Ligand binder design. Structure first.
Ligand SMILES: [Ca+2]
Ligand SMILES: [Ca+2]
Length: 263
């Protein structure tokens, strides 16, 4: 289920990573490799991860994309996608984000978890995930597809590390006992204006399901979710474009807020 030669995987990873590192968009790689499979794309993504680890970057978490059934159906895929988070993606609450290093960023309000027990697929579901959750963390992702197109293409997006670029953690880190992740409300404010509202249920119906799906996806490549893994479970709100000069704050009910300023 792979159509790329290894040379192509390596060349694509370099090409796609450079778009991120050098802050410029590129054509969707499925335009030059229309037969690219998800296995191909994950090979490319994991190769980008390897490139980053090889230069000393710590991989500090994972994120989940396409965590909406409606969006999956629209894309004609049956599962979400994942990407990894590198250490330098991290932005502190209230932190300043330099858009000169970004292409056309948007933010998404998410709830992250840190696990305290290993999780694996296949066949992982909500019930298997609950005991393994240590705490939850309000997290705003900054996504920034390195592709210049308008169509979301899941395979290219996977190769592009699911458009990962920054994540902003903040608010209170709460145990699962304190939080109903389905009804967890978020309010995204941009420049003083409420621009998106959402509830955790927007992530598959239950954000923790995203963790189970991640375990299942990782299991396809013979990986799992080790205890202590930080996982951004998916966009609760529609993604909101940001630009220099923007200030955003996302309030999480009962868990404080996550803010960032863009320059
Ligand atoms: Ca996201
Ligand atoms: Ca805050």
């Amino acid at each position: 289920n792979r159509t790329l030669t290894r040379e192509q995987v390596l060349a694509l990873a370099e090409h796609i990573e450079n778009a991120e590192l050098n802050v410029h968009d590129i054509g969707k790689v499925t335009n030059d490799f229309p037969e690219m499979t998800f296995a191909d794309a994950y090979d490319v993504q994991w190769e980008i991860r390897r490139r980053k680890e090889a230069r000393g970057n710590k991989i500090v978490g994972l994120k989940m994309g396409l965590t909406s059934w409606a969006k999956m159906a629209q894309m004609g895929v049956e599962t979400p996608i994942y990407g990894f988070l590198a250490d330098y993606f991290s932005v502190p609450d209230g932190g300043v984000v330099d858009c000169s290093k970004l292409i056309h960023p948007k933010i998404e309000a998410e709830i992250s978890v840190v696990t305290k027990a290993p999780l694996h697929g296949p066949g992982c579901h909500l019930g298997d995930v609950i005991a393994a959750i240590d705490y939850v963390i309000p997290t705003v992702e900054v996504i920034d597809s390195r592709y210049e197109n308008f169509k979301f293409d899941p395979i290219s997006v996977v190769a592009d590390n699911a458009s990962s670029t920054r994540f902003i953690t903040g608010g209170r880190m709460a145990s699962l006992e304190e939080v109903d992740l389905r009804t967890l409300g978020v309010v995204m404010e941009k420049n003083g204006e409420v621009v998106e509202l959402g509830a955790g249920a927007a992530v598959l119906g239950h954000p923790l399901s995203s963790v189970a799906m991640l375990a299942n996806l990782l299991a396809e490549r013979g990986e799992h979710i080790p205890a202590g893994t930080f996982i951004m479970t998916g966009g609760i709100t529609a993604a909101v474009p940001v630009a220099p000069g923007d200030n955003i704050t996302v309030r999480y009910q009962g868990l404080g807020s996550v803010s960032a300023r863009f320059i």
